Design a protein around this ligand. Structure first.
Ligand SMILES: CCCCCCCCCCOc1cncc(CC(P(=O)(O)O)P(=O)(O)O)c1
Ligand SMILES: CCCCCCCCCCOc1cncc(CC(P(=O)(O)O)P(=O)(O)O)c1
Ligand SMILES: [Mg+2]
Ligand SMILES: [Mg+2]
Ligand SMILES: [Mg+2]
Ligand SMILES: [Mg+2]
Ligand SMILES: [Mg+2]
Ligand SMILES: [Mg+2]
Lengths: 358, 358
């Protein structure tokens, strides 16, 4: 619980210790270690760690208490999720052309790193996960299923980003394998602006790895049978939380202090299907849909200001407040159908600190 | 090459079929399918497939013959290696700023793709491997070890590229987390120009995934005990072949026909530690080391020509011929110490078609 934040060095060093036994000259081993120590420290730390904590809490309250050897396996899984998060955020910042993350410059922007290194380093963080899982859970019975869950959550997240990045592109309105020169100028597509499509995306890009994966890890580790019907109930609660979480992420993109959120809002300029876009479209007048189509997705201050002002005009802040209230209720209703008092507590607890933390 | 080249569609479609069962609207499922079918087709096909073939041949000759159900598991592992190769090459081309690969434009250059998609797609190809391995070998006893081998070969390759890309950088002569502005202009470092360091790199970036991984897969699948002392003999032969193979790759970078190799030589402009660089440095005069340092790593045709002409002047073509002859001998000497006539045949056979194919 507090156990968690202090176990970081243990797992970081376990992994770095694997690197250190490679057949490399000694000057090179030292340099590798400096680099990969910074990679982990810079990218895994400084987060709210809600996904990691969720593995730890699910583990405790699924059981009747847990020795400090069993805790070591729990916290390992917990840091793996936080490393997965690190890997994804490094990648997302390359794809979304990010500036700031957790209040510092994005990894890929550092001049001793650059994109060439950033990409390589994503795949390293990602694989570190499974090396760590092998070190601490090779001999557990859930081993194969735990690595199977990380794998299948990751795949859903990958398709998730794929749609996040491409739902408005010419591709989706045959792929031209001879064009390496003429870039499409980003333009929204009206057919795609609807909650149905938005849910598909947000569920795949967020719900599985942020909520399903950590919940299922804890349970798997605590001995709960994979075949059990509680998993399909957990999957549906995970879908609702992810929707709830991502829409909040989208709200912060427009209305959050970039010093408080740690990052800079870019959804409009990057042509993203976001909840405020969809809500404004279902509420606004025809003259304003034209105004939306001719200003969205353009990396141009005056165009962005048009869209932000429409969001002020159509009182989107008030509409969010209203959504947050209704969804929180749909979610609590789903939690109370689990009939498991421990998980129910953890999920209610999570639902409260989802935006604060700690 | 018979069974193998025709089983592609089977494994491609298995995986695409997994994607198609995701909870997505039907118009999106169709678009996903077009895209991911092209991703596989465009990037897995058109290679010499030497690593795939090596899994198949090791599998046959380790045994006394194999039903078409057991062949299905073999060819699966074989295509997984070729998919791994595909994933790596898509990545390498982003990192090395590639133009052409297997005689077509690099994936990341296509305008419907771009880097943002290329990166996402690498992680998808990579994860497709383990999904496929689960489909066809979940119930085999070597399952856990086979996925353990892919994982540990990939890690070595990642550190391999890391050194390939960074051996000459200021990092390696402390990383500044506040510099996003002053990009270092690439310049060689004299201390690093030596075979010792070169071996470290080429072994990690090539030897493990191109030779050790496919050999060890076949053996694992054929029931050979993981603990056996034949594996450490196989590892050392793998190091010698990888050195042999990569040096040839480096030679082709300057002296190969870009229509025959399918790619454009870029080692000099990208500031790479290559075998010809090291050999020229061992042989050349001080006025030419200055000439090397001034012109290497600059993305400029006239600078590259200066270095190419030094490579002509110092008769590097003849020096390669000489290396190829001695190493081929060191390799055959190692093969003959295996005391296993089947593997010995496959490895001798591989050694011959390593540059032609088929
Ligand atoms: C092999 C290298 C390829 C690996 C790439 C795997 C793709 C997974 C990364 C994307 O997954 C994400 C899911 N939800 C959230 C984010 C954060 C951002 P947003 O969702 O773009 O709004 P933000 O925090 O800036 O608002 C990222
Ligand atoms: C997270 C996304 C990145 C995932 C990390 C995977 C990086 C591993 C790439 C290793 O790639 C290669 C290994 N050996 C050989 C080559 C031949 C190339 P080069 O000579 O090394 O440029 P070529 O001459 O064929 O162009 C490539
Ligand atoms: Mg994004
Ligand atoms: Mg983003
Ligand atoms: Mg956002
Ligand atoms: Mg390279
Ligand atoms: Mg290259
Ligand atoms: Mg090369």
């Amino acid at each position: 619980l507090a156990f968690f934040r202090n176990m970081y060095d243990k797992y970081r060093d376990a992994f770095l210790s694997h690197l250190n036994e490679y057949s490399l000259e000694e000057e090179i081993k030292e340099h590798i270690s400096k680099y990969y120590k910074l990679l982990f420290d810079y990218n895994c730390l400084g987060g709210k760690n809600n996904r990691g904590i969720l593995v730890i809490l699910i583990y405790e309250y699924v059981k009747n208490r847990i020795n400090s050897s069993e805790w070591e396996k729990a916290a390992c899984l917990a840091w793996c999720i936080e490393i997965l998060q690190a890997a994804f955020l490094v990648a997302d910042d390359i794809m979304d052309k990010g500036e700031m993350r957790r209040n510092k410059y994005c990894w890929y922007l550092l001049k001793d790193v650059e994109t060439k290194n950033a990409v390589n380093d994503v795949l390293l963080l990602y694989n570190s996960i499974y090396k760590l899982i092998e070190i601490y859970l090779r001999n557990e019975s859930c081993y194969v299923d735990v690595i199977a869950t990380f794998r299948d959550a990751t795949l859903k997240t990958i398709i998730g980003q794929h749609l996040d990045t491409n739902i408005f592109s010419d591709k989706y309105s045959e792929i031209d394998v001879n064009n390496i020169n003429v870039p499409e100028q980003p333009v929204i597509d009206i057919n795609m602006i609807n909650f149905g499509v938005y849910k598909n995306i947000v569920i795949h890009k967020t719900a599985y790895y942020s909520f399903f994966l950590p919940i299922v890890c804890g349970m798997l580790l605590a001995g709960i049978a994979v075949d059990n019907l509680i998993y399909k109930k957990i999957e549906d609660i995970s879908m609702l939380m992810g929707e709830y979480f991502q829409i909040h992420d989208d709200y912060l993109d427009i209305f959050g202090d970039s010093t408080k959120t740690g990052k800079v809002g870019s959804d409009i300029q990057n042509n993203k299907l976001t909840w405020p876009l969809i809500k404004t479209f279902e509420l606004c007048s025809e003259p304003d849909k034209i105004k939306i189509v001719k200003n969205y997705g353009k990396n141009n201050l005056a165009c962005v200001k048009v869209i932000d002002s429409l969001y002020e005009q159509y009182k989107i802040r008030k509409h969010y407040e209203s959504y947050e209230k209704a969804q929180k209720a749909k979610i609590l209703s789903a939690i109370n159908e689990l009939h498991h008092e421990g998980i129910e507590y953890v999920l209610k607890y999570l639902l409260e600190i989802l935006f604060t933390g700690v």
